[PDB]
Structures are given as C-alpha cells and as structure tokens.
Amino acid sequence: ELPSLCMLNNSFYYMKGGANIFLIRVSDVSVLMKEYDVSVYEPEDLGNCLNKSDSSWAIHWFSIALGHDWLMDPPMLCRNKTKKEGSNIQFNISKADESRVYGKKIRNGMRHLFRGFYDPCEEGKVCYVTINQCGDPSSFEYCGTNYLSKCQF
C-alpha cells in the first residue's frame, strides 16, 4: 500500500510506486530555472511533470513524507513533460537563507525515510533532491538491472 524505498548510497535512492520506479538523487547541481521550467504549486500540477498518469500519486506521497507543505512551502520545480529529455522534479534544500528552514525540514524527512542518509549540503551553496522517472532519458543508465538488483523490489 505504501511505495517501496531503497537506498543505494548517500546520494542515490529509489522509490517504487506500483509499476513505476523513480531515481532520487541528492546533489549540488541543478539545470532547472524558476520562470523557465514548471512551478508545481498544487499536487495536480505534477501532471505537467510526468507523462504517465499513474506516477503523480507516488511523487505526491514522497513529497508529503518529506514534510512538504503544499499550501505554504516553496513550489517544487520540474521539467515540462513536453520535453523529450525527460522528467526532472526538484526540491531546493540549499543551506542559504531563503531556503534554509525548508531545506532543514526536507533533510529531516529524508533522514526519517532513509535512516542512513547523512547531510551532504554545504553552507551557503546550492543543494537539491532531484527525481527522474525510470524509463525516461533523464534516468540515463541508473535504472538498469545492475543498479536495481541492489534494491528489494
């Protein structure tokens, strides 16, 4: 009934929600841009981030699990599903004054979902949690069997 979660290492994680699998990475680089890419204001805006209808519930579940407040928190950014390059849904957790409180909350959520998670975000620098759906070109090689066989799925 809940999505299944896997931790590969401190930067690479996976979620399985029904038939869909998602690559979740913690990193210090983003190629998304507010007012160019899509701002995810409400849960149903996730439909503009993902080509599969049955994927939105799982991403929403994960957002709630991390502590995202849909009404009040900074909107997630995502790449529009009309782009062939593939899904890229992003939480900005930077240790910088504008996103500081939010990032702390989201890292606490990561810690609660993956007890082995340690904080890799540097003070005054950018830091992100980024999700790509397996099977989109934006997942590159990382949903191959040589990766996923390390997860329980």
Ligand X SMILES: *[C@@H]1O[C@H](CO)[C@@H](O)[C@H](O)[C@H]1NC(C)=O
Ligand Y SMILES: *[C@@H]1O[C@H](CO)[C@@H](O[C@@H]2O[C@H](CO)[C@@H](O)[C@H](O)[C@H]2NC(C)=O)[C@H](O)[C@H]1NC(C)=O
Interacting residues with ligand X (CB under 6 A): 8-12, 38, 48, 51, 80-82, 84, 86, 136
Min dist CB 78 to ligand X, Å, is 9
Among positions 98, 118, 120, 140, the unique one binding ligand Y when judged by CB under 6 A: 98
How many Cβ atoms are within 10 Å of 89's Cβ, its own excluded?
Answer: 27
CB-wise, 53 or 82, nearer to ligand X? 82
Min dist CB 89 to ligand Y, Å, is 12
β-bridge partners, 14: 6, 23
Q: Which residues of 99-117 are buried (b: 16+ CB within 10 A; e: fewer)?
A: beebbebbbebbeebbeeb
Contact in structure between 110 and 26 (CB atoms under 8 Å): yes
CB-wise, 32 or 113, nearer to ligand Y? 32
- Residue 29 touching ligand Y (CB under 6 A): no
